[PDB]
Amino acid sequence: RAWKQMSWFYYQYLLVTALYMLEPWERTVFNSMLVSIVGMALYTGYVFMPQHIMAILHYFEI
């Protein structure tokens, strides 16, 4: 049942970001750019931002 939930979440992502309209290669281009930017932000956060905030967030989630 979790797979149906995740497919629905992806469908909502497509509806919100207007990727529903676009052809599959355009979707792949957008997703690649998004994950590249996410990785860049993660690396920059690792270089400078303290991990203490991450530990606090993990404790709050747990």
Partner 1 sequence: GLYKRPFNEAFEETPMLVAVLTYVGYGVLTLFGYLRDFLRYWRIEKCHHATEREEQKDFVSLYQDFENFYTRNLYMRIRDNWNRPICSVPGARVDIMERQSHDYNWSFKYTGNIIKGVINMGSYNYLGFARNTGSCQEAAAKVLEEYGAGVCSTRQEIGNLDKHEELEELVARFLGVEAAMAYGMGFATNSMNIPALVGKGCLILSDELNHASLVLGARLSGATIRIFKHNNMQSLEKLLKDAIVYGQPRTRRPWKKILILVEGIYSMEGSIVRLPEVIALKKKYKAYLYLDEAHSIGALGPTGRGVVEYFGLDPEDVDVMMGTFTKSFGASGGYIGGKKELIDYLRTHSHSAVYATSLSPPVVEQIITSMKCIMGQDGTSLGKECVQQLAENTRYFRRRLKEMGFIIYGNEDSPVVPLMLYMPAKIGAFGREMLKRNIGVVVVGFPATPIIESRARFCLSAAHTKEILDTALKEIDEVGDLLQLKYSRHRL
In the numeric block, which tokens belong to residue 33? 């750019």
13: which residues sit within 8 A by CB, 6+ positions away? 19
CB of 14 to partner 1, least distance (A): 7
How many Cβ atoms from other residues are within 10 Å of residue 10's Cβ?
A: 11
Q: What residues make contact with partner 1 under the rule CB under 8 A?
A: 12, 14-23, 26, 30
How many Cβ atoms from other residues are within 10 Å of residue 30's Cβ?
A: 14
Residue number with CB closer to partner 1 (16 or 62): 16
CB of 44 to partner 1, least distance (A): 23
Residue number with CB closer to partner 1 (26 or 49): 26
CB of 56 to partner 1, least distance (A): 27
